[PDB]
Amino acid sequence: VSSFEKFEIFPKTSSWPNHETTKGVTAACSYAGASSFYRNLLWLTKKGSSYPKLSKSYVNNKGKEVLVLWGVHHPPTGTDQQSLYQNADAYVSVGSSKYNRRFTPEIAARPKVRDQAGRMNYYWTLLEPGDTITFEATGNLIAPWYAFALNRGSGSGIITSDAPV
Amino acid sequence: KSYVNNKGKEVLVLWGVHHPPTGTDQQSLYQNADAYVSVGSSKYNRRFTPEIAAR
């Protein structure tokens, strides 16, 4: 990939009216001494007490591949599940024309990594010129916020080096 | 059960998960019709179910 165009696939301030999009946010993604989160994904929590089925679709009209990234949260014994997403029996489903996977919360307490005892899984898929991608979820979705239109070329690729630029 | 690796080297841990045939046997061994087995470390993490099935 020799270039891309980042774009906001589901704008944060416009996409999620009946879900909570603001706070949080974790200590583990701290920016300048305050809790934060990834710039390119959105941790959607329940808007006081309810978390209805969301269904967002996006159609790839960029005329090139779109890289979409998202996450699925697995809270520790929750409680936390209930306190974030309400729905004890929640699911997250992502499908396109090609790809298709169904994720569950997997309530499980794990050795604290960055003071955190839940885990978050990260996924990606390349959406082909033309295709639709549908997200359906009743909790645990770390929704995409920004995504990438890819340009393939001979500007490929990746090195590890400590030489100065 | 938890174990902390203080050997100052890698520890290989092995375990099993049983899938009984139509049980009954499940009930007769483990009581809990709706049982689960969860193993996690800092790196690894998997959740197993009985998969009652006669083979």
PDB file of N, CA and C in Angstrom, chain B residues 15-33 35-39 48-55:
ATOM      1  N   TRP B  15      -3.634 -29.300  29.663  1.00  0.00           N
ATOM      2  CA  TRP B  15      -4.884 -29.634  30.301  1.00  0.00           C
ATOM      3  C   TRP B  15      -5.814 -30.250  29.290  1.00  0.00           C
ATOM      4  N   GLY B  16      -6.952 -30.768  29.741  1.00  0.00           N
ATOM      5  CA  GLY B  16      -7.960 -31.275  28.823  1.00  0.00           C
ATOM      6  C   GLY B  16      -9.351 -30.756  29.125  1.00  0.00           C
ATOM      7  N   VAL B  17     -10.229 -30.894  28.129  1.00  0.00           N
ATOM      8  CA  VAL B  17     -11.656 -30.590  28.228  1.00  0.00           C
ATOM      9  C   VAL B  17     -12.385 -31.826  27.718  1.00  0.00           C
ATOM     10  N   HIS B  18     -13.339 -32.313  28.503  1.00  0.00           N
ATOM     11  CA  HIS B  18     -14.066 -33.517  28.143  1.00  0.00           C
ATOM     12  C   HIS B  18     -15.365 -33.181  27.426  1.00  0.00           C
ATOM     13  N   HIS B  19     -15.659 -33.913  26.358  1.00  0.00           N
ATOM     14  CA  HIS B  19     -16.962 -33.879  25.714  1.00  0.00           C
ATOM     15  C   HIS B  19     -17.563 -35.277  25.849  1.00  0.00           C
ATOM     16  N   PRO B  20     -18.514 -35.451  26.789  1.00  0.00           N
ATOM     17  CA  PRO B  20     -19.226 -36.711  27.030  1.00  0.00           C
ATOM     18  C   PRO B  20     -20.149 -37.038  25.876  1.00  0.00           C
ATOM     19  N   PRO B  21     -20.580 -38.322  25.720  1.00  0.00           N
ATOM     20  CA  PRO B  21     -21.596 -38.656  24.702  1.00  0.00           C
ATOM     21  C   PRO B  21     -22.931 -38.204  25.246  1.00  0.00           C
ATOM     22  N   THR B  22     -24.040 -38.418  24.557  1.00  0.00           N
ATOM     23  CA  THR B  22     -25.279 -37.964  25.205  1.00  0.00           C
ATOM     24  C   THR B  22     -25.232 -38.305  26.710  1.00  0.00           C
ATOM     25  N   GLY B  23     -25.108 -37.260  27.510  1.00  0.00           N
ATOM     26  CA  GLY B  23     -25.093 -37.428  28.928  1.00  0.00           C
ATOM     27  C   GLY B  23     -25.947 -36.313  29.475  1.00  0.00           C
ATOM     28  N   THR B  24     -26.603 -36.479  30.636  1.00  0.00           N
ATOM     29  CA  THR B  24     -26.718 -37.746  31.384  1.00  0.00           C
ATOM     30  C   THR B  24     -25.404 -38.126  31.998  1.00  0.00           C
ATOM     31  N   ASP B  25     -24.479 -38.572  31.158  1.00  0.00           N
ATOM     32  CA  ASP B  25     -23.092 -38.708  31.530  1.00  0.00           C
ATOM     33  C   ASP B  25     -22.539 -37.349  31.967  1.00  0.00           C
ATOM     34  N   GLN B  26     -22.851 -36.299  31.206  1.00  0.00           N
ATOM     35  CA  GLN B  26     -22.473 -34.943  31.596  1.00  0.00           C
ATOM     36  C   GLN B  26     -22.973 -34.699  33.001  1.00  0.00           C
ATOM     37  N   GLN B  27     -24.282 -34.884  33.191  1.00  0.00           N
ATOM     38  CA  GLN B  27     -24.950 -34.688  34.475  1.00  0.00           C
ATOM     39  C   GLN B  27     -24.321 -35.583  35.540  1.00  0.00           C
ATOM     40  N   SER B  28     -24.146 -36.864  35.215  1.00  0.00           N
ATOM     41  CA  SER B  28     -23.545 -37.844  36.120  1.00  0.00           C
ATOM     42  C   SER B  28     -22.076 -37.624  36.474  1.00  0.00           C
ATOM     43  N   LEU B  29     -21.362 -36.783  35.723  1.00  0.00           N
ATOM     44  CA  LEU B  29     -19.944 -36.516  36.018  1.00  0.00           C
ATOM     45  C   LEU B  29     -19.749 -35.160  36.637  1.00  0.00           C
ATOM     46  N   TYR B  30     -20.493 -34.182  36.132  1.00  0.00           N
ATOM     47  CA  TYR B  30     -20.245 -32.774  36.428  1.00  0.00           C
ATOM     48  C   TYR B  30     -21.457 -32.012  36.947  1.00  0.00           C
ATOM     49  N   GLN B  31     -22.619 -32.663  37.012  1.00  0.00           N
ATOM     50  CA  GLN B  31     -23.886 -32.048  37.468  1.00  0.00           C
ATOM     51  C   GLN B  31     -24.392 -30.980  36.501  1.00  0.00           C
ATOM     52  N   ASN B  32     -23.602 -29.921  36.359  1.00  0.00           N
ATOM     53  CA  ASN B  32     -23.967 -28.748  35.582  1.00  0.00           C
ATOM     54  C   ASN B  32     -24.200 -28.965  34.070  1.00  0.00           C
ATOM     55  N   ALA B  33     -25.460 -29.179  33.694  1.00  0.00           N
ATOM     56  CA  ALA B  33     -25.843 -29.270  32.287  1.00  0.00           C
ATOM     57  C   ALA B  33     -25.235 -28.129  31.448  1.00  0.00           C
ATOM     58  N   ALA B  35     -22.304 -26.059  31.662  1.00  0.00           N
ATOM     59  CA  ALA B  35     -20.992 -25.884  32.252  1.00  0.00           C
ATOM     60  C   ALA B  35     -20.079 -25.291  31.220  1.00  0.00           C
ATOM     61  N   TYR B  36     -18.973 -24.716  31.678  1.00  0.00           N
ATOM     62  CA  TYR B  36     -17.992 -24.077  30.820  1.00  0.00           C
ATOM     63  C   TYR B  36     -16.622 -24.211  31.479  1.00  0.00           C
ATOM     64  N   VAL B  37     -15.568 -24.054  30.680  1.00  0.00           N
ATOM     65  CA  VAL B  37     -14.182 -24.121  31.132  1.00  0.00           C
ATOM     66  C   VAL B  37     -13.460 -22.969  30.503  1.00  0.00           C
ATOM     67  N   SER B  38     -12.851 -22.148  31.340  1.00  0.00           N
ATOM     68  CA  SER B  38     -12.180 -20.961  30.872  1.00  0.00           C
ATOM     69  C   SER B  38     -10.735 -20.926  31.337  1.00  0.00           C
ATOM     70  N   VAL B  39      -9.829 -20.732  30.388  1.00  0.00           N
ATOM     71  CA  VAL B  39      -8.415 -20.687  30.694  1.00  0.00           C
ATOM     72  C   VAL B  39      -7.869 -19.405  30.134  1.00  0.00           C
ATOM     73  N   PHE B  48     -14.151 -22.875  26.748  1.00  0.00           N
ATOM     74  CA  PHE B  48     -14.599 -24.158  26.234  1.00  0.00           C
ATOM     75  C   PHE B  48     -15.929 -24.558  26.840  1.00  0.00           C
ATOM     76  N   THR B  49     -16.708 -25.274  26.040  1.00  0.00           N
ATOM     77  CA  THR B  49     -18.037 -25.771  26.397  1.00  0.00           C
ATOM     78  C   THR B  49     -18.072 -27.309  26.361  1.00  0.00           C
ATOM     79  N   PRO B  50     -18.941 -27.930  27.174  1.00  0.00           N
ATOM     80  CA  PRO B  50     -19.110 -29.348  26.901  1.00  0.00           C
ATOM     81  C   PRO B  50     -19.752 -29.411  25.538  1.00  0.00           C
ATOM     82  N   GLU B  51     -19.370 -30.358  24.712  1.00  0.00           N
ATOM     83  CA  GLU B  51     -20.110 -30.459  23.457  1.00  0.00           C
ATOM     84  C   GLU B  51     -20.699 -31.828  23.369  1.00  0.00           C
ATOM     85  N   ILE B  52     -21.778 -32.013  24.131  1.00  0.00           N
ATOM     86  CA  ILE B  52     -22.420 -33.302  24.290  1.00  0.00           C
ATOM     87  C   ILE B  52     -22.664 -33.822  22.886  1.00  0.00           C
ATOM     88  N   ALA B  53     -21.999 -34.918  22.542  1.00  0.00           N
ATOM     89  CA  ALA B  53     -22.104 -35.495  21.208  1.00  0.00           C
ATOM     90  C   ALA B  53     -21.500 -36.893  21.156  1.00  0.00           C
ATOM     91  N   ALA B  54     -22.282 -37.843  20.642  1.00  0.00           N
ATOM     92  CA  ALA B  54     -21.888 -39.238  20.624  1.00  0.00           C
ATOM     93  C   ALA B  54     -21.135 -39.447  19.354  1.00  0.00           C
ATOM     94  N   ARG B  55     -19.946 -40.021  19.467  1.00  0.00           N
ATOM     95  CA  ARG B  55     -19.025 -40.148  18.335  1.00  0.00           C
ATOM     96  C   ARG B  55     -18.636 -41.603  18.171  1.00  0.00           C
TER      97      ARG B  55
END
